[PDB]
Amino acid sequence: HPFVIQMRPDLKGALLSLIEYYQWDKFAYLYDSDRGLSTLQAVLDSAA
Amino acid sequence: TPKGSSLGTPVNLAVLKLSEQGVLDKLKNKWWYDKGECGA
């Protein structure tokens, strides 16, 4: 999206890399709707 | 298995599953004393 400058970085890859560092095979994800389901989408696709 | 493998636990469970079902013993007999050419 244009003309939008997001000061905040993207955390998705860091979370996935961390889950891969702890080498979890199964876990519980508690997500806040008001935050957006983007990370949920990331971890679901990387789950599959 | 490489430690942390997604295959470790199901493979383990499969091994003891096969052991309890008599599969491992049957295979041992199959390759050891069935193909054995000297039996006595």
Side-chain angles (χ1 to χ4, degrees), chain A residues 25 27-33 35-42:
Chain A
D25 184 1
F27 53 88
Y29 192 62
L30 293 181
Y31 59 97
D32 191 35
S33 35
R35 193 172 206 84
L37 299 80
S38 181
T39 59
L40 178 58
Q41 293 177 335

Side-chain angles (χ1 to χ4, degrees), chain B residues 1 7-21 24:
Chain B
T1 67
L7 273 189
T9 52
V11 165
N12 168 76
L13 269 217
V15 173
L16 43 80
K17 183 76 183 166
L18 296 171
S19 104
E20 294 180 352
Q21 284 185 315
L24 290 177

Side-chain angles (χ1 to χ4, degrees), chain A residues 25, chain B residues 4 6:
Chain A
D25 184 1
Chain B
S6 304

Side-chain angles (χ1 to χ4, degrees), chain A residues 9-22 24:
Chain A
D10 187 27
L11 189 60
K12 292 182 292 297
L15 179 60
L16 295 171
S17 290
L18 180 54
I19 292 168
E20 192 180 357
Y21 168 53
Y22 290 30
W24 293 354

Side-chain angles (χ1 to χ4, degrees), chain B residues 26-36:
Chain B
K26 190 270 142 175
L27 289 178
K28 177 174 184 186
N29 265 275
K30 185 188 170 182
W31 291 98
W32 261 248
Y33 304 131
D34 286 20
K35 295 298 181 183

